[PDB]
Design a protein around this nucleic acid. Sequence first.
RNA 1: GGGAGACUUGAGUGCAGAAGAGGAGAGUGGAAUUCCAUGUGUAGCGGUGAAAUGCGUAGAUAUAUGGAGGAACACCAGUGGC
Length: 116
Amino acid sequence: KNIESGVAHIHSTFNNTIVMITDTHGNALAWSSAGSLGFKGSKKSTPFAAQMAAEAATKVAMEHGLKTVDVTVKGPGSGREAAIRSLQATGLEVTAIRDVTPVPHNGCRPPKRRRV
RNA sequence: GGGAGACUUGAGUGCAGAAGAGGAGAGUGGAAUUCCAUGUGUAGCGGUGAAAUGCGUAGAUAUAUGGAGGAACACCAGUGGC
């Protein structure tokens, strides 16, 4: 009901950006996404949409009561820095930022190339 | 070319060293994917040139802790080696 420290996950792909604010233990608190802000198609991938999604999610998280957050950037999307700055501006104290883009150690075979 | 010898340079052995993803067998490690279980959580997620099919309120995606199992071995890595 009331929290002080939490985590903000920024999953930004080539299509859409999702921002998920949880407690420091990962229990979800609030989340938003360019798709949930009405953006569609290519617009969802734009840095601006990442900014807006971060903004809305920060509002709800702070409304729940939350000051400091640590950010995890995932995916090769473009809106990462826009989302980070949106969090700061909306008020949350970005304590730390880490890149968690999964990197298979070879592992599973990726899908084929396009247009072949 | 044949026959009887001689020789050590080719060829091989001995002796002393060097490198290596060479092969075969038995084990074994971590990342990641998927699935399964359980929390949180809510309306999207995913995808394209643009869309739709599809998955999702029977609670999805995300997210956290685990579990299962399979395949391939990131960085090293290099007209590098064998």
